[PDB]
Amino acid sequence: SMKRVQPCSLDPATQKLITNIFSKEMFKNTMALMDLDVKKMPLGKLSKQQIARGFEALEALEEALKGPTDGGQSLEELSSHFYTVIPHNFGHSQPPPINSPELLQAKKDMLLVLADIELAQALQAVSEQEKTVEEVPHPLDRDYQLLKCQLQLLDSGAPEYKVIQTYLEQTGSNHRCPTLQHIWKVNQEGEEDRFQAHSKLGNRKLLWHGTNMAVVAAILTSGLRIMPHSGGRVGKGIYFASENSKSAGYVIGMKCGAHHVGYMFLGEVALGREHHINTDNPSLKSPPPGFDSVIARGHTEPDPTQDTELELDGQQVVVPQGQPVPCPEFSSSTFSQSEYLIYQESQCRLRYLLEVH
Numbered sequence: 001s002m003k004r005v006q007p008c009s010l011d012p013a014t015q016k017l018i019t020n021i022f023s024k025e026m027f028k029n030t031m032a033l034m035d036l037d038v039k040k041m042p043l044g045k046l047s048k049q050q051i052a053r054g055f056e057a058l059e060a061l062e063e064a065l066k067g068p069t070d071g072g073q074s075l076e077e078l079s080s081h082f083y084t085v086i087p088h089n090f091g092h093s094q095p096p097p098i099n100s101p102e103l104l105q106a107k108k109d110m111l112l113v114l115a116d117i118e119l120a121q122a123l124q125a126v127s128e129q130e131k132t133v134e135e136v137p138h139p140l141d142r143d144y145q146l147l148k149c150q151l152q153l154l155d156s157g158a159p160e161y162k163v164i165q166t167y168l169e170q171t172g173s174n175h176r177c178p179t180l181q182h183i184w185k186v187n188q189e190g191e192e193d194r195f196q197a198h199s200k201l202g203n204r205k206l207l208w209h210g211t212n213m214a215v216v217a218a219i220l221t222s223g224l225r226i227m228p229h230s231g232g233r234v235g236k237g238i239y240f241a242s243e244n245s246k247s248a249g250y251v252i253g254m255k256c257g258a259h260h261v262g263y264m265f266l267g268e269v270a271l272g273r274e275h276h277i278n279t280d281n282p283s284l285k286s287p288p289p290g291f292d293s294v295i296a297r298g299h300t301e302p303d304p305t306q307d308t309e310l311e312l313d314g315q316q317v318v319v320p321q322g323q324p325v326p327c328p329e330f331s332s333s334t335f336s337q338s339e340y341l342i343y344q345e346s347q348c349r350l351r352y353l354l355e356v357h
């Protein structure tokens with residue numbers, strides 16, 4: 001009646017990673033960091049229904065914000081309802097009334113993150129196959145399997161190692177230097193099929209995607225997703241950066257003794273015909289007709305003459321390798337750094353996962 005736990009098959013680096021991204025503490029920290037009341041709303045109580053009800057509250061809230069004094073219920077009152085569904089903590093003071101587009105998008109962001117934490121929580125739920133079996137896998141092995149995603153750790157002697165590292169350092173911040181620790185090759189199986197579609201679609205680049213640790217698991221499972229209610233300076237799509245230092249701004253650092261651990265994805269993106277804008281536009285949901293991507297061109301770009309290429313699945317993929325240089329053409333843009341945009345999930349394939357300090 002005493003089931004056996006089998007020895008773990010994973011190496012140390014991958015154990016740490018799996019530990020981190022499923023860590024209850026890490027999840028609770030993220031929630032606290034978003035002013036969520038963790039005691040009034042425990043990880044094991046997070047439901048998709050609550051999150052849905054949460055979203056509805058923001059929707060109604062938006063109708064009031066956009067609608068010129070409609071005549072319905074006030075922002076103050078409608079906010080109270082939102083907080084009633086999704087408990088907040090501010091040192092036991094009255095939660096702040098949502099009364100601005102900025103704040104409306106703030107709560108949507110949090111709800112979207114919370115959503116991927118719940119996704120991770122439901123992922124760990126014990127099934128029946130795991131109960132009828134008399135020999136259970138090492139907890140880390142099991143969680144890793146729940147991902148349904150091959151993560152293969154690379155080393156100093158991997159073809160794409162000196163490349164991903166040169167990319168990292170030249171584009172990163174000159175001073176607050178980010179430090180490479182580990183690189184995992186990511187074969188998210190389930191993306192392979194739908195990505196085949198754009199095989200004729202050229203112009204492929206390897207771009208950065210910074211993310212806080214709370215959703216990393218969710219992404220390793222479902223891939224990058226165009227979510228409802230997600231907005232940005234370039235509209236509703238999946239955002240990428242060519243400059244590392246841009247994406248790392250979105251990598252919330254989690255403490256581990258003396259160092260701050262962080263994870264970043266590298267993605268293969270089928271950009272195709274690029275549409276270059278130099279001004280904000282939060283209303284875009286697709287490129288202009290004839291275009292496959294939109295690129296908010298910043299004041300600088302990794303020296304294009306230093307570009308190199310890798311071969312991923314028979315395809316040449318562009319990898320930036322130079323320090324950012326000025327682009328005189330876009331010296332007056334509203335973007336400091338480039339923001340690459342695709343508006344269909346299929347144009348993106350996760351290739352690499354990094355740990356930095």
Ligand SMILES: O=C(c1cc(Cc2n[nH]c(=O)c3ccccc23)ccc1F)N1CCCNCC1
Nearest residue numbers: 209210225230231232238239240241247250339
């Ligand atoms: O990439 C985004 C997105 C990102 C951002 C910010 C952001 N996040 N992360 C980045 O690496 C990044 C890079 C360049 C520009 C922005 C970013 C804002 C709104 C978003 F909709 N997605 C939206 C959220 C869900 N998961 C898929 C991706």
